[PDB]
Design a protein around this ligand. Structure first.
Ligand code: ADP
Ligand code: ADP
Ligand code: MG
Ligand code: MG
Lengths: 454, 454
């Protein structure tokens, strides 16, 4: 019994069906065997040489993919765009007509029959818009108590006391800019605020996107998908943090602005952005309604560095026997001392810590030290090289443990490693140095000895 | 039993029909059952293998989409453009041949048949060109009385006194430029004038488009769609304000200039444009016939700030009991005196209010204070920070209500938050400061302390 196929389009009271077979739409009668009521829109039906619907199958599983623009008002049809930007209306097959179809989704289609059969999930798209459980907590962050309070007030506080906000006629902020010199805590602070917020659901969503991930379709589609997924998770009533890390590279702006304005309706979606370059930011992003709350994560001072070191010099690190000698086996007092020694030597104004020499337009010259260019990322890197020198010490001398001297040697080795490179400094620093003097910087020099343009 | 299909093209005196079936154009006989006079252009018809019309169906509801260029003279044909820029003429089916089909509308089409069956609305084009009831009124806007008279004289007055305008041979203005530093009221006035003019109808339309919306089809298709809708609403005889907010980004201009010039015939359509960057504006937009009326929204002086505070420090805000003591429970007097104290504070030349230092080309230096860089947005954000600090004090101290100190602390906090970044300052300020001094500005810095590019 040699037989052909077609796509089912419509079922009537007549007990006949409209089927797309052999490249054209025809009305065909069903065999008495098959029940015409149990058939479904878009289902592949089997035929014979009299062209009678003998059997019902499943939905077509291979074909063209189109990107869904919208579902039309009637609910049955959808507007989709193909590879050549050809825009077409098609019927939604039964597996679509929870989860909700949204603008940006990829649908398998037969454009000859005019049907859309399935939603094809795409990784890359999924792993772009994926929510993550945040790693970091406020206890992992050192030296930023002030800024943790600002981010709490902006993000966390509105949700906890909704009615007290309504009482004082205060509309909560909805966008945050983290900004400042690199390696100082903006990624950490953003994850930590998402973490403490999730912990106060004792059911929370945190989308982490880095700048480079956007430039990977074209940036329009990236932003459209990201905010559409935020829209999805927002429907549940849950708080949704959409974090744009490493935003430096971006400034593309008009869709980001347009999408942030678009989520103003939704009271539970918050946008946080992070930028190393305050100066290159498009002012549009910082206007009322968008990134309202501007939180500056600065470089650490001596007191902050003691806190940051405490996160990486724990008492679960092997300590050398000579170091423990001076504190008679008490590792709490040994380390807290070791952290105070390593910080004092990092932050002191000695000829060994000299880093830059600045020359101003009036002929004056000032010398900057490591104290003025430190970061949390640099403190951690100093600890990691100290650990690696202890691991080398184990192997080379036989004696286990981390000495004070491994850290102290690691400071100047770490700063010498970055006493050339462009990663180490930032316009916020030159602005700050120039500012305090009140003069323009005309010549910079490191102290090996190298020069840097102004 | 098994039957095919086709599209109806024309009906004759012969009681026969032209039908597009199976990729070809046919003359077919209607069955005796069918009344050929009641059939309609572009309608789907069922057949048999004798190829005789047995039933009238509905119109095709899936397929290609094209953008309508125009309707031809005969009234029955449309010139449409498909996805590959393939322009074609097609017949209009009955449901099109109320409302008005216009250039820009998306039409469902079968190009092989040569027919357009339906106008499919698009969500994103519909939300672009949607009118809105304006939120803001003149009572909500503080400190801009002159500018409110100027916007009234341009937009409102022509419509109220048409025959008095005719008497003096005065042609009414076509368009308004709102321009000045950011955060000072330009958006507010534009919707306040749409509001007061809608109130003088006791039907009027107000389209609100932001620059960013245009950049996200191509930029000049956006502008065609907007002005084509403005024509649709102008046909009613009522006023139509088309507001282009946040145009800083734009300057593309040619289609804007062309569409403003084209709409000058319709004297019930007004175009308002807002810009923060006076200096970057293409002079073409400001030439006679287009944005004739230039209204400058400046930064508020002390007395303007009194009026702006009063919009956000109302006596329906909880006020602390200690603050209510000194006016014996009188809230009007308590708040009026609170507003005078916070204003006097923020407009003072105290060391706490030092903002920037401007160095000139002759060596002279001038200290700029907060008063010189204030705005309506900053006043409101100072109020919102105080409201937040009240909310925190009730949680922390138990004692409800907002203290004067919450406002006063909030001033320096809000300025410190924005001391660093862009869009707190603007080229109009340097013009003003360089102007009043009569010297070029060579170096600038904030007073943390930090320099700016100039
Ligand atoms: N304040 C801090 N406390 C503890 N660790 C820090 C701190 N700042 C930076 N670090 C360390 O250095 C890394 C730098 O990351 P990040 O916080 O993202 O800086 P940035 O925001 O400049 O990229 C962190 O992953 C962390 O290991
Ligand atoms: N003159 C004013 N009176 C009252 N509030 C103002 C005034 N100017 C600005 N604001 C406040 O600050 C915000 C900035 O508004 P807007 O008028 O859009 O400034 P822009 O000129 O930058 O478009 C407004 O939402 C409003 O809350
Ligand atoms: Mg980071
Ligand atoms: Mg505005």
């Amino acid at each position: 019994p040699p037989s052909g196929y077609g796509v089912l389009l419509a079922t009537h009271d007549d007990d006949t069906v409209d089927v797309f077979t052999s490249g054209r739409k025809m009305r065909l009668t069903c065999s008495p065997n098959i029940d015409a009521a149990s058939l479904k829109k878009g289902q592949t039906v089997r035929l014979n040489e009299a062209l009678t619907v003998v059997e019902a199958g499943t939905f077509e599983a291979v074909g063209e993919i189109s990107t869904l623009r919208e579902i039309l008002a009637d609910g049955h049809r959808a507007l989709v765009v193909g590879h050549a930007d050809e825009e077409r209306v098609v019927w939604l097959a039964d597996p679509l007509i929870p989860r909700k179809l949204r603008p940006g989704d990829s649908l398998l289609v037969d454009t000859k029959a005019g049907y859309a059969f399935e939603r094809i999930p795409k990784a890359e798209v999924e792993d772009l818009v994926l929510e993550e459980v945040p790693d970091v907590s406020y206890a992992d962050i050192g030296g930023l108590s002030r800024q943790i309070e600002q981010i709490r007030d902006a993000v966390e506080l509105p949700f906890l006391h909704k009615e007290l906000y309504r009482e004082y006629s205060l509309r909560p902020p909805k966008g945050v800019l983290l900004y400042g010199p690199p390696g100082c805590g903006k990624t950490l602070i953003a994850k930590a605020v998402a973490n403490s917020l999730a912990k106060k659901m004792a059911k929370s969503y945190f989308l982490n996107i880095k700048g480079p991930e956007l430039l990977n379709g074209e940036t329009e589609r990236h932003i459209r998908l990201i905010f559409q997924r935020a829209r999805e998770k927002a429907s549940e009533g849950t708080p949704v943090i959409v974090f744009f890390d490493e935003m430096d590279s971006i400034f593309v702006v008009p869709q980001l602005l347009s999408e942030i304005d678009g989520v103003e309706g939704l009271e539970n979606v918050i946008v946080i952005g992070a930028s190393n370059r305050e100066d290159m930011i498009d002012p549009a992003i910082l206007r009322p309604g968008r990134l309202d709350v501007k939180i500056k994560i600065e470089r650490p001072d001596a007191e902050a560095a003691q806190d940051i070191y405490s996160k990486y010099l724990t008492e679960f690190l092997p300590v050398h026997a000579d170091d423990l000698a001076e504190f008679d086996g008490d590792r709490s007092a040994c380390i807290k001392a070791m952290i105070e020694k390593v910080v004092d030597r990092m932050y002191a104004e000695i000829d060994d810590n000299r880093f830059l020499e600045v020359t101003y337009a009036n002929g004056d010259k000032e010398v900057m030290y490591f104290k003025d260019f430190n970061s949390g990322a640099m403190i951690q890197n100093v600890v990691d090289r100290a650990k690696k020198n202890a691991i080398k010490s184990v192997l080379e001398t036989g004696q286990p443990g981390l000495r004070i001297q491994h850290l102290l040697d690691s400071i100047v080795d770490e700063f010498a490693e970055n006493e050339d490179l462009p990663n180490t400094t930032n316009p916020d620093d030159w602005a700050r140095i120039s500012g305090k003097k009140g003069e323009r910087i005309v010549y910079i020099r490191t102290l090996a000895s190298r020069a840097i343009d102004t």
